[PDB]
Amino acid sequence: SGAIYVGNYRVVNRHLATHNDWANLVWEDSSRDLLVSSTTAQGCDTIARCDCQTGVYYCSSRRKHYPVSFSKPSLIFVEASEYYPARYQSHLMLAVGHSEPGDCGGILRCQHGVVGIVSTGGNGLVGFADVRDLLWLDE
Ligand SMILES: C[C@H](C(=O)N1CCC[C@H](C(N)=O)C1)c1cncc(F)c1
Ligand SMILES: [Zn+2]
């Protein structure tokens, strides 16, 4: 679990969105596993606007942060699950590192700010849903 709070927006994994998230929906994209809902209290996370390929992510299954090198956002195959059938997930970034079901929502950060959130894993790899392209999150 985990969310990004920027301005009057809450950014979560689409498969983990709550009833409240859907009742205050701003935008959702099943192919990115992203959902953005509106909030009443102001958020103070800063979003990175860059093409950084190194950063640090929070892994809740180890209660630790890990430094990672990660690939550029692209179309990557994701196995079938209880939430989605087998498909290519867009805007996805891979890194070598520990992740297990329950780690989705952990933030990935660089010196510029929030890069994305954990969305996929397994095979000794971790996948991150990029948020850097969502320029409207700051307006
Ligand atoms: C099996 C699961 C996963 O990758 N899912 C299921 C939940 C939806 C994900 C998606 N379609 O974007 C794919 C998982 C395994 N290891 C680490 C994780 F953070 C998650
Ligand atoms: Zn950066």
Active site residues per annotation: 15, 33, 104
Distance (angstroms) between ligand 1 centre and the Cα of 64 equals 19
| Binding site members | 50, 52, 110, 112
| Short-list 4, 2, 7, CA closest to 137 | 7
- Resolution of this entry in Å? 1.5
- Compute the CA torsion angle 2, 131, 124, 57 (nearest 10 deg): -60
Q: How many Å apart are CA 58 and CA 82, to the nearest integer? A: 24
Q: How many Å apart are CA 104 and CA 80, to the nearest integer? A: 16
User: Which ligand gives the minimal distance to the CA of 117?
Assistant: 1
Q: Are 101 and 59 in contact (CB under 8 A)?
A: no
Q: Is 116 touching ligand 1 by the criterion CB < 6 Å?
A: no
Which of 34, 119, 120, 126 best tests ligand 1's pocket when mutated (most atoms within 8 Å of CB)? 120
Q: Where are the domains of the chain?
A: 3-44, 45-139
Q: Are 91 and 129 in contact (CB under 8 A)?
A: yes
Q: Where do we find the tokens 């859907």? A: 22
Q: What is the chain's length? A: 139
